């Protein structure tokens, strides 16, 4: 039953708060969503969670231990981690070798298991067609299923999925949604943010809302569907799910 806690997060970037105060609670076998506008804090949350950037305020607890200061590699063996929003791949690095290259990074695997995950993870995601593919040759929903694929290859305990559905087609977004639901039943905290709504809302058992920096609104789904100040601010007056 690991915590994972983030207490009054902030950033600046050259005088501009973008990141006023937020805060937030992923447990083991959860699904939490961030959402919200455009400009609103959310990757930069997540990098202040993950350690990609230096928080200027907050703190981050796993369990009752403060890793506030520990660095980005120290909170990835505590078990964070994180699928970036950008490109992520490796260019020039096949299908194959982009997951071993996170799989090479494992302790907790050996030279075999590490082949074995390789090819699960292909199959699980549907790229076995594509093993010899250079990462530059992929298409954007094919190179989203290999970044999310890496991100899982590094066996996170909280995985921080920063749009995964990003150029991802409906069906495909069935099938991550699905492996989503697994990691949870694994045992995995899940946070995720992204701007598909419906499909985010549908496989979050809650989420936060931010706006410019600092937090609106708490709640599970249907709360948040129904919130008239998140239909104002966020999802638009006349939005249907
Ligand atoms: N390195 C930076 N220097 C200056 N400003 C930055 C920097 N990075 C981000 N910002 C600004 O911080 C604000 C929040 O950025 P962030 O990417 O965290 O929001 P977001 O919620 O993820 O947005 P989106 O939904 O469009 O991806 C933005 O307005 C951005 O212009
Ligand atoms: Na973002």
Same mark, same amino acid.
């Given at each position: ?10 950033? @600046? ?5 973008? =990141?006023?105060?937020?805060?937030? &609670? ?18 930069? &949350?997540?990098? *202040? ?14 369990? $009752? ?31 194959? $070798?982009?997951? *071993? @290259? ?11 298991? %590490? ?6 993870? *292909? ?10 593919? *250079? ?7 094919? %190179? ?5 694929? %890496?991100?899982?290859? @590094? ?13 991802? $087609? ?13 990691? %949870? ?7 995720? &943010?992204?701007?598909? =709504? ?23 789904? &249907? ?6 100040? =998140? ?11």
């Amino acid at each position: 039953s690991a915590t994972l806690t983030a207490k009054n997060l902030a950033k @600046a970037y050259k005088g501009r708060r973008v =990141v006023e105060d937020v805060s937030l &609670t992923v447990n083991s076998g959860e699904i939490v969503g961030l959402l919200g506008p455009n400009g609103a804090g959310k990757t930069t &949350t997540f990098y *202040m969670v993950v350690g990609i950037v230096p928080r200027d305020a907050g703190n981050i607890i796993i369990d $009752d231990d403060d890793i506030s200061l520990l660095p980005l590699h120290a909170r990835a063996r505590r078990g964070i981690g994180y699928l970036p929003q950008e490109a992520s791949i490796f260019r020039r690095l096949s299908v194959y $070798d982009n997951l *071993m @290259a996170v799989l090479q990074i494992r302790d907790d695997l050996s030279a075999e298991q %590490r082949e074995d995950r390789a090819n699960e993870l *292909m199959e699980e995601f549907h790229i076995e067609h594509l093993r010899d593919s *250079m990462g530059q040759s992929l298409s954007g929903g094919e %190179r989203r299923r290999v970044e999310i694929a %890496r991100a899982l290859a @590094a066996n996170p305990k909280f995985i921080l999925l920063d749009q995964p559905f990003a150029g991802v $087609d409906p069906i495909s977004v069935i099938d991550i949604k699905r492996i989503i639901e697994h990691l %949870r039943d694994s045992g995995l905290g899940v946070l995720i &943010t992204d701007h598909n =709504v419906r499909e985010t809302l549908a496989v979050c058992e809650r989420a936060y809302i931010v706006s410019q920096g600092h937090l609106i609104a708490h709640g599970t789904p &249907t709360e948040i569907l129904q919130d008239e100040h =998140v239909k104002r601010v966020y999802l638009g007056e006349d939005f249907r799910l």
